[PDB]
Design a protein around this nucleic acid. Structure first.
Ligand SMILES: [Mg+2]
Ligand SMILES: [Mg+2]
Ligand SMILES: [Mg+2]
Ligand SMILES: [Mg+2]
Ligand SMILES: [Mg+2]
Ligand SMILES: [Mg+2]
Ligand SMILES: [Mg+2]
Ligand SMILES: [Mg+2]
Ligand SMILES: [Mg+2]
Ligand SMILES: [Mg+2]
Ligand SMILES: [Mg+2]
Ligand SMILES: [Mg+2]
Ligand SMILES: [Mg+2]
Ligand SMILES: [Mg+2]
Ligand SMILES: [Mg+2]
Ligand SMILES: [Mg+2]
Ligand SMILES: [Mg+2]
Ligand SMILES: [Mg+2]
Ligand SMILES: [Mg+2]
Ligand SMILES: [Mg+2]
Ligand SMILES: [Mg+2]
Ligand SMILES: [Mg+2]
Ligand SMILES: [Mg+2]
Ligand SMILES: [Mg+2]
Ligand SMILES: [Mg+2]
Ligand SMILES: [Mg+2]
Ligand SMILES: [Mg+2]
Ligand SMILES: [Mg+2]
Ligand SMILES: [Mg+2]
Ligand SMILES: [Mg+2]
Ligand SMILES: [Mg+2]
Ligand SMILES: [Mg+2]
Ligand SMILES: [Mg+2]
Ligand SMILES: [Mg+2]
Ligand SMILES: [Mg+2]
Ligand SMILES: [Mg+2]
Ligand SMILES: [Mg+2]
Ligand SMILES: [Mg+2]
Ligand SMILES: [Mg+2]
Ligand SMILES: [Mg+2]
Ligand SMILES: [Mg+2]
Ligand SMILES: [Mg+2]
Ligand SMILES: [Mg+2]
Ligand SMILES: [Mg+2]
Ligand SMILES: [Mg+2]
Ligand SMILES: [Mg+2]
Ligand SMILES: [Mg+2]
Ligand SMILES: [Mg+2]
Ligand SMILES: [Mg+2]
Ligand SMILES: [Mg+2]
Ligand SMILES: [Mg+2]
Ligand SMILES: [Mg+2]
Ligand SMILES: [Mg+2]
Ligand SMILES: [Mg+2]
Ligand SMILES: [Mg+2]
Ligand SMILES: [Mg+2]
Ligand SMILES: [Mg+2]
Ligand SMILES: [Mg+2]
Ligand SMILES: [Mg+2]
Ligand SMILES: [Mg+2]
Ligand SMILES: [Mg+2]
Ligand SMILES: [Mg+2]
Ligand SMILES: [Mg+2]
Ligand SMILES: [Mg+2]
Ligand SMILES: [Mg+2]
Ligand SMILES: [Mg+2]
Lengths: 48, 185, 172, 159, 58
RNA sequence: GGUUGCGGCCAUAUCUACCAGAAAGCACCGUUUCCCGUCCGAUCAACUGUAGUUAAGCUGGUAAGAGCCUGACCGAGUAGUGUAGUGGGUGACCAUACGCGAAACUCAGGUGCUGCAAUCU
RNA sequence: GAGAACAGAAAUCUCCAGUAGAACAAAAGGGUAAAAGCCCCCUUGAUUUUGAUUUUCAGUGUGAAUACAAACCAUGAAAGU
RNA sequence: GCCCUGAAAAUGGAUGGCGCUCAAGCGUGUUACCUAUACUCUACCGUCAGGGUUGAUAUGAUGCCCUGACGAGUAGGCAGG
RNA sequence: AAAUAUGUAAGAAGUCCUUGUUACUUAAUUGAACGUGGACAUUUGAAUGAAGAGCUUUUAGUGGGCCAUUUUUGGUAAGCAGAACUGGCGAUGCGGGAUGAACCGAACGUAGAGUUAAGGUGCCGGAAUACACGCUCAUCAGACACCACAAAAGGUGUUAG
RNA sequence: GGAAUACUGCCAGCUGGGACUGAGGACUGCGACGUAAGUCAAGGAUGCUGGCAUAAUGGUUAUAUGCCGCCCGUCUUGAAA
RNA sequence: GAAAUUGUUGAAAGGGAAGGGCAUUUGAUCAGACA
């Protein structure tokens, strides 16, 4: 209930940029997708 | 862009004023959207919609169908509302008293009701008398008694009546309508 | 793959009823972050034991820092690598000041001399060549000679303006 | 021309299971079926009468009829963008009771229990199932278990 | 002039615009195709208990 | 525990060779008037339970036995596979990333469990 | 496989072994061992009534099939079929 | 591994062109920087939706006020002009 | 004997008790079906979502399709012929791949500011003649997916093994 | 032995430069600061000063310049062809 | 007394077509508003 109450957050693109030159590979291969664990905060904070 | 999960700009699909163009009906609508907006009473809300209803969703309630609903346990003193016209039914030989409120009353129906010392109210009078619709019994007539719906769903083994003009034998009663002529439906 | 850290990664075989306290295995792992490093761990562990991450657990992840980060050391490096037409075992010696530095330029070297991308390499051992004269490869022996001194001929200064009024000089 | 007869493509499907040919064991016939029973459908190729068509193989349905040597099962087959109701006259050699509801029934009978056995104590129940939760903290020891340190291996050929 | 022969291409796209409508369920389904010997008796069975329940409100 | 009649799962019950089996029971076994069947009382039918025998059946045990059953981080996280990339490669094909994961192999363990009724040192 | 006058590679007789390696009109694939195969005995259910159902499907028709109901019969000691 | 031989076609000609050789080439790393009708925020138009408001004594009740989301389009449908 | 696909179930139309109806059915008030009366509420029976769900009528256009990854048949092969699943183009502009129906990015009301994607940043051309380690000198060097080709075989050129 | 530092993270710590926007139009809400009276950056810009009062700004138009832009209609899988 | 199409006058532009989009310079032309 608590979480569905929130609309999905609408983030802008990252301000720093994506790290990486190509997004649609796994984080673990130098890309942006997948579980990147605690490194999620650096991203979101650039997007928020 | 957005992966839409549902068709955009969809109209609700419900009437919202009558399509009718009669002032009086337009006025009764005025009464009841007011009444609906300010009385949290279910009755007014149902009544308002029925007003928008087109002619086919407004089948006539007969005066015999009326008498029967009054025979419900504990219902004989209720005033019956019919958002539509009320027709007469020679087939009943003893009509009760009560008070019917409806849009139209055919001449004979009005007669029969008044003869038994009943009363015929218009919805606006029904309003002043029972703004929350207290003690009201709402009746609808039969929609699927229309002749049209006989032909709905025509198909093999549906058993549903042909769109046909002239009828009698040698009008669509041979091949495919009997085991002895090709097959059956 | 990036600029490497070196990690101890410890893991073990999800416990059971009949086998609680499973054996525990360690790897040192050269990787840019601990996310790549745990991945790598499972990558090799499923090459040696019957586990997979699904049925196993990481126990500890710790960064190993260089012992004496400002001492020049002679590293011998063992590597396994995949070429286009078959796979291969190698030994190189790299001279730098940390193992982490060393692995940075190994990876560079494999890439440049053998066209081996990071996926196709396995570090086998990285280990400090203790006593000199066990140093094998001459491109390193070279730098171990007594009283070593060499000039840097033909100096290029980087200009900052587009135009110059001099004619330069590569003296030095 | 093409061929699309009733039992077409069924070579292995109505085949008989290795070392399991012959008479059907008698329990197949001692089993009892009531309307509402959920059965699973599997053709016994040894029994040609009362056979389900291949499409209904491996399908689960509900009994709607019980006759001398058969049960009538009703399956929802989806033809088009929609399901229609299909009714199957199967002999008992092609039907078995599903366990697809055993865990539900075991769950309910048991939910009645700890529901009373809690109420009649002092409430506090919790009897919806929950998915696998992530595991919790814990402390692994070294006592008797120092970490063994593996490296990757050289390339070798053995052949 | 030969032309294409058959394809199911795009067909489940269409199937999904307006459903795959689930199968629709009812309390009291039809006795359609049920054993006539049963059904005959069952009727009288029902007629009876009906009579019994009118007999409860005499 | 044995045995018998009727069984359920249908090889851990089968197969090959050898040995052991108290008591009851099964059995083999005697007969041809009668019902009944045969080229043949071998099968099948009947009669005796009397005249005989554990030889066979049957039951059990042995065997670095054949087979079969079970297990295992034995092989193997191998083969194969769902997903990803403007990954490698002239191609053929091949690595990598998030997942799913065999079969043969090898080693160990095992060799009918059991329901109803009657009977039995 | 082993045995028996003429009799031989092949005639007819016996015994051992035999999971089907045969046979079941026909293409092939399923299936079958006190049978579904072979031999014999008795037979006409290959019949009468009108619906339901599965395949192909439009959920039309046709072909073929399935499980019942109401008859009348066949067979068998019978359960049954 | 890179490079070289293997390596022959028709108007003059194409790593897109110029040109580039410790590259402006090949492999690999690290930063920074450029910019889509996309992403975030704001205004405005329209569409859909949800609320509010007949109380007179002035001017639209198909109106007025608040709020939120959404906007590609051939064949084609409907709507308001 | 996989993976991917695939049927069903996860309750109020539920679970339990009591004991009516019948011509079916049992040796049998035995059973079968349908019930009357009674007991237990939202941790009432997994997750996530739901700009709601259900239903009815009537009618257009269409009934040449083509493409990409993967699976795949015929063919020496094809910018060839034919199937499977999805995603596309057709019907669609916008940014990138100089160019281009289908690739990559991203789907369009009128505009401001910001940030990016794919792809780029010597000059054409907005954007480092940036940083770093190697490699490579071609009297037809090479230069970025789809893509606009090259092979066996050789070199005492050079590099690392 | 005792420190420092990097690296990663946190602060409802302070603070400078720059750009775009200023919808709304009495009041009404949630707050903040004050002992208080009051004040406020708290449900959307005001304050102060200047210049022109005109072709100054703006529209239109022609031309020039940067980048971009094939011929519509059609039938087609596919047309600038 | 339209248009295609023509003469004349005036203004402008033109290195292998022309016309078009966004934007602004320059010329010409013009509305509104100030008070
Ligand atoms: Mg920042
Ligand atoms: Mg920036
Ligand atoms: Mg910065
Ligand atoms: Mg790139
Ligand atoms: Mg931001
Ligand atoms: Mg009528
Ligand atoms: Mg160290
Ligand atoms: Mg065929
Ligand atoms: Mg057998
Ligand atoms: Mg038959
Ligand atoms: Mg033709
Ligand atoms: Mg063709
Ligand atoms: Mg066609
Ligand atoms: Mg004895
Ligand atoms: Mg005789
Ligand atoms: Mg004898
Ligand atoms: Mg006998
Ligand atoms: Mg003996
Ligand atoms: Mg015996
Ligand atoms: Mg053995
Ligand atoms: Mg392989
Ligand atoms: Mg795969
Ligand atoms: Mg590829
Ligand atoms: Mg692999
Ligand atoms: Mg056959
Ligand atoms: Mg038998
Ligand atoms: Mg016949
Ligand atoms: Mg037919
Ligand atoms: Mg046919
Ligand atoms: Mg070139
Ligand atoms: Mg260039
Ligand atoms: Mg480079
Ligand atoms: Mg825009
Ligand atoms: Mg539109
Ligand atoms: Mg599923
Ligand atoms: Mg739910
Ligand atoms: Mg929800
Ligand atoms: Mg809703
Ligand atoms: Mg239509
Ligand atoms: Mg049509
Ligand atoms: Mg056609
Ligand atoms: Mg048509
Ligand atoms: Mg595609
Ligand atoms: Mg077309
Ligand atoms: Mg498009
Ligand atoms: Mg473009
Ligand atoms: Mg190109
Ligand atoms: Mg992609
Ligand atoms: Mg140029
Ligand atoms: Mg530039
Ligand atoms: Mg820079
Ligand atoms: Mg490639
Ligand atoms: Mg070569
Ligand atoms: Mg060489
Ligand atoms: Mg304002
Ligand atoms: Mg304003
Ligand atoms: Mg003036
Ligand atoms: Mg003026
Ligand atoms: Mg002026
Ligand atoms: Mg002019
Ligand atoms: Mg112009
Ligand atoms: Mg152009
Ligand atoms: Mg045409
Ligand atoms: Mg053509
Ligand atoms: Mg004139
Ligand atoms: Mg302009």
């Amino acid at each position: 209930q608590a979480n569905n109450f929130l609309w999905p957050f609408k983030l802008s693109n990252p301000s720093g940029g994506w790290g990486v030159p190509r997004k649609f590979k796994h984080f673990i291969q130098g890309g942006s997708f997948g579980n990147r664990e605690e490194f999620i905060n650096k991203l979101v904070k650039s997007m928020n | 862009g957005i992966d839409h999960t549902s068709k955009q700009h969809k109209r609700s699909g419900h009437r919202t004023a009558p399509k009718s163009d009669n002032v009086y009906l337009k006025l009764l609508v005025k009464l009841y959207t007011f009444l609906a907006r300010r009385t949290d009473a279910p009755f007014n809300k149902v009544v308002l919609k029925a007003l928008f209803l087109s002619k086919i969703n407004r089948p006539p309630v007969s005066v015999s169908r009326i008498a029967r609903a009054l025979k419900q346990e504990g219902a004989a003193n209720k005033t019956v509302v019919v958002v539509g016209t009320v027709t007469d039914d020679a087939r009943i030989f003893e009509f009760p008293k009560t008070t019917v409120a409806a849009l139209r009353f055919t001449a004979g129906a009005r007669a029969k009701i008044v003869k038994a010392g009943g009363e015929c109210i218009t919805l606006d009078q029904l309003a002043v008398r029972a703004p929350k619709g207290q003690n009201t019994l709402i009746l609808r007539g039969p929609r699927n008694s229309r002749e049209a719906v006989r032909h709905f769903g025509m198909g093999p083994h549906k058993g549903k009546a042909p769109r046909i003009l002239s009828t009698g034998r040698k009008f669509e009663r041979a091949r495919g309508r009997r085991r002895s002529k090709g097959f059956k439906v | 793959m990036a600029h490497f850290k070196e990690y101890q990664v410890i893991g073990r075989r999800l416990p059971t009823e009949s086998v609680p306290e499973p054996k525990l295995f360690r790897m040192r792992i050269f990787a840019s972050n601990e996310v790549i490093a745990k991945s790598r761990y499972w990558y090799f562990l499923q090459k040696l034991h019957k586990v997979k991450k699904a049925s196993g657990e990481i126990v500890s992840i710790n960064q190993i820092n260089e012992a004496h980060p400002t001492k020049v050391k002679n590293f011998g490096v063992w590597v396994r690598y995949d070429s286009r037409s078959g796979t291969h075992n190698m030994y190189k010696e790299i001279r730098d000041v940390s193992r982490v530095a060393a692995v940075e330029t190994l990876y560079q070297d494999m890439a440049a001399r053998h066209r081996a991308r990071f996926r196709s390499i396995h570090i086998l051992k990285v280990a400090e060549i203790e006593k000199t004269a066990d140093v094998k490869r001459q491109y390193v022996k070279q730098f171990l000679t007594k009283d070593l001194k060499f000039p840097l001929p033909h100096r290029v200064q980087k200009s900052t303006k587009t135009f110059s009024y001099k004619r330069p000089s590569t003296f030095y | 021309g093409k061929s699309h007869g009733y039992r077409s493509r069924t070579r292995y499907m109505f085949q008989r299971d290795f070392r399991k040919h012959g008479a059907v064991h008698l329990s197949t016939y001692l089993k009892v079926y009531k309307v509402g029973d959920i059965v699973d459908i599997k053709a016994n190729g040894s029994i040609q009468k009362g056979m389900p068509h291949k499409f209904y193989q491996g399908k689960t349905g509900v009994v709607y009829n019980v006759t001398k040597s058969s049960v009538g099962v009703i399956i929802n087959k989806m033809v088009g963008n929609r399901y229609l109701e299909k009714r199957l006259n199967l002999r008992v050699e092609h039907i078995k009771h599903s366990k697809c509801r055993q865990e539900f029934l075991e769950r309910v009978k048991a939910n009645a229990a700890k529901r009373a056995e809690a109420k009649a104590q002092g409430v506090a129940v919790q009897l919806k199932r929950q998915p696998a939760q992530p595991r919790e903290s814990r402390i692994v020891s070294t006592e008797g278990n120092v970490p063994q340190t593996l490296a990757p291996v050289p390339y070798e050929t053995f052949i | 002039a030969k032309s294409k022969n058959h394809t199911a291409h795009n067909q489940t796209r269409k199937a999904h615009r307006n459903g795959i409508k689930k199968p629709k369920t009812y309390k009291y389904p039809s006795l359609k195709g049920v054993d006539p010997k049963f059904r005959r008796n069952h009727k009288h069975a029902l007629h009876g208990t009906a009579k019994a329940l009118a007999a409860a409100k005499k």
